[PDB]
Design an enzyme around this catalytic site. Sequence first.
Site, PDB file in Angstrom:
ATOM      1  N   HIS A  57       0.846  -1.206   0.000  1.00 14.12           N
ATOM      2  CA  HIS A  57       0.000   0.000   0.000  1.00 14.12           C
ATOM      3  C   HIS A  57       0.889   1.267   0.000  1.00 14.12           C
ATOM      4  O   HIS A  57       0.366   2.362   0.064  1.00 14.12           O
ATOM      5  CB  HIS A  57      -0.959   0.002   1.222  1.00 14.12           C
ATOM      6  CG  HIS A  57      -0.423   0.376   2.614  1.00 14.12           C
ATOM      7  ND1 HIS A  57      -0.135  -0.418   3.618  1.00 14.12           N
ATOM      8  CD2 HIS A  57      -0.159   1.661   3.057  1.00 14.12           C
ATOM      9  CE1 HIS A  57       0.285   0.304   4.616  1.00 14.12           C
ATOM     10  NE2 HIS A  57       0.271   1.568   4.298  1.00 14.12           N
ATOM     11  N   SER A  97       4.002   3.164   8.022  1.00 14.78           N
ATOM     12  CA  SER A  97       3.694   2.088   7.039  1.00 14.78           C
ATOM     13  C   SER A  97       4.864   1.687   6.174  1.00 14.78           C
ATOM     14  O   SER A  97       5.576   2.584   5.766  1.00 14.78           O
ATOM     15  CB  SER A  97       2.583   2.521   6.034  1.00 14.78           C
ATOM     16  OG  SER A  97       1.316   2.358   6.685  1.00 14.78           O
ATOM     17  N   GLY A  98       5.053   0.416   5.913  1.00 11.52           N
ATOM     18  CA  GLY A  98       6.161  -0.087   5.056  1.00 11.52           C
ATOM     19  C   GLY A  98       7.406  -0.319   5.819  1.00 11.52           C
ATOM     20  O   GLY A  98       8.294  -1.003   5.335  1.00 11.52           O
ATOM     21  N   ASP A 105       0.370  -7.616   1.835  1.00 12.86           N
ATOM     22  CA  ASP A 105       0.827  -6.200   1.782  1.00 12.86           C
ATOM     23  C   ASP A 105       2.350  -6.091   1.767  1.00 12.86           C
ATOM     24  O   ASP A 105       2.938  -5.610   2.712  1.00 12.86           O
ATOM     25  CB  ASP A 105       0.254  -5.502   2.986  1.00 12.86           C
ATOM     26  CG  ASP A 105       0.398  -3.999   2.900  1.00 12.86           C
ATOM     27  OD1 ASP A 105       0.706  -3.479   1.848  1.00 12.86           O
ATOM     28  OD2 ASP A 105       0.186  -3.324   3.892  1.00 12.86           O
ATOM     29  N   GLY A 156       2.519   7.087   8.458  1.00 10.23           N
ATOM     30  CA  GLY A 156       3.873   7.620   8.154  1.00 10.23           C
ATOM     31  C   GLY A 156       4.874   6.490   8.425  1.00 10.23           C
ATOM     32  O   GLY A 156       5.957   6.462   7.865  1.00 10.23           O
TER      33      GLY A 156
HETATM   34  C1  123 Z   1      -5.285   7.447   6.892  1.00 10.39           C
HETATM   35  O1  123 Z   1      -4.263   7.340   5.904  1.00 10.39           O
HETATM   36  C2  123 Z   1      -3.266   6.382   5.969  1.00 10.39           C
HETATM   37  C3  123 Z   1      -2.560   6.086   4.805  1.00 10.39           C
HETATM   38  C4  123 Z   1      -1.570   5.110   4.813  1.00 10.39           C
HETATM   39  C5  123 Z   1      -1.278   4.420   5.991  1.00 10.39           C
HETATM   40  O2  123 Z   1      -0.307   3.429   5.951  1.00 10.39           O
HETATM   41  C6  123 Z   1      -1.988   4.720   7.184  1.00 10.39           C
HETATM   42  C7  123 Z   1      -1.689   4.023   8.370  1.00 10.39           C
HETATM   43  N1  123 Z   1      -2.449   3.967   9.458  1.00 10.39           N
HETATM   44  C8  123 Z   1      -1.711   3.187  10.230  1.00 10.39           C
HETATM   45  C9  123 Z   1      -1.998   2.761  11.534  1.00 10.39           C
HETATM   46  C10 123 Z   1      -1.056   1.926  12.183  1.00 10.39           C
HETATM   47  C11 123 Z   1      -1.256   1.446  13.492  1.00 10.39           C
HETATM   48  N2  123 Z   1      -0.485   0.462  13.911  1.00 10.39           N
HETATM   49  N3  123 Z   1      -2.198   1.957  14.267  1.00 10.39           N
HETATM   50  C12 123 Z   1       0.135   1.554  11.494  1.00 10.39           C
HETATM   51  C13 123 Z   1       0.386   1.993  10.205  1.00 10.39           C
HETATM   52  C14 123 Z   1      -0.564   2.804   9.619  1.00 10.39           C
HETATM   53  N4  123 Z   1      -0.591   3.350   8.461  1.00 10.39           N
HETATM   54  C15 123 Z   1      -2.978   5.702   7.159  1.00 10.39           C
END
Ligand code: 123
Length: 223
Positions: A40, A177-178, A84, A175
């Site tokens: 993603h 993510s990945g 993913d 932020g």
């Molecule tokens: C709302 O927009 C976005 C866009 C890309 C994301 O990876 C995310 C995102 N939410 C996330 C929440 C989490 C967590 N562990 N609570 C981790 C990675 C995430 N990445 C949100």
Amino acid sequence: IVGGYTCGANTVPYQVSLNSGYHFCGGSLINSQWVVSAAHCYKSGIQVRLGEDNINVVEGNEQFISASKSIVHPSYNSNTLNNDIMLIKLKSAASLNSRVASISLPTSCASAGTQCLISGWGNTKSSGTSYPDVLKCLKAPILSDSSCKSAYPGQITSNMFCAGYLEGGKDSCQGDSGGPVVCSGKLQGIVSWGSGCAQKNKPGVYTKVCNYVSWIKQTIASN
Ligand SMILES: COc1ccc(O)c(-c2nc3cc(C(N)=[NH2+])ccc3[nH]2)c1
Ligand SMILES: [Ca+2]
């Protein structure tokens, strides 16, 4: 990363920042020319930034390399986020040293209770946005599949695992993510999703890398 701490410059040498004119995702260096991130996080126009600490200042040790291609897993499903994972090949090989190093892939999956290090430049607040300049770290344990599935009923596949704190307060966030979830020196997870950030009973969900090591090796061997 909510509830984490400053890692310290270059202490997480395999961490990369995926940049398209701003930091948008994290990633992990697995060899001098390949990075692993989440599917993603895909987009074209990706510059991979290695040796970073303060992503807004050039302080030295940084290597900016353009992505030659990104390979999203063929079975990635953007509605469930199953599979993913994405591999990015770099236009040129990175110079590996002590500040830029690759992380090893696992030979076995990790068990619940294993303590892992999650790092990233994602949000540090669970309510509002506060993005840091430097890399943040969080030590979190992998949770049992029963707690993971009771938290996200019907949303967890065998390619996902939960890691975190059910009392809330500490978690990865947007932020991040990945990026890497490293346990015992091996890349075991990729930050994938969660419901909000650091909310009680809503742990972070990660891509279970041990299920993709042969796919990663076969794909790198043929590209
Ligand atoms: C709302 O927009 C976005 C866009 C890309 C994301 O990876 C995310 C995102 N939410 C996330 C929440 C989490 C967590 N562990 N609570 C981790 C990675 C995430 N990445 C949100
Ligand atoms: Ca910098």
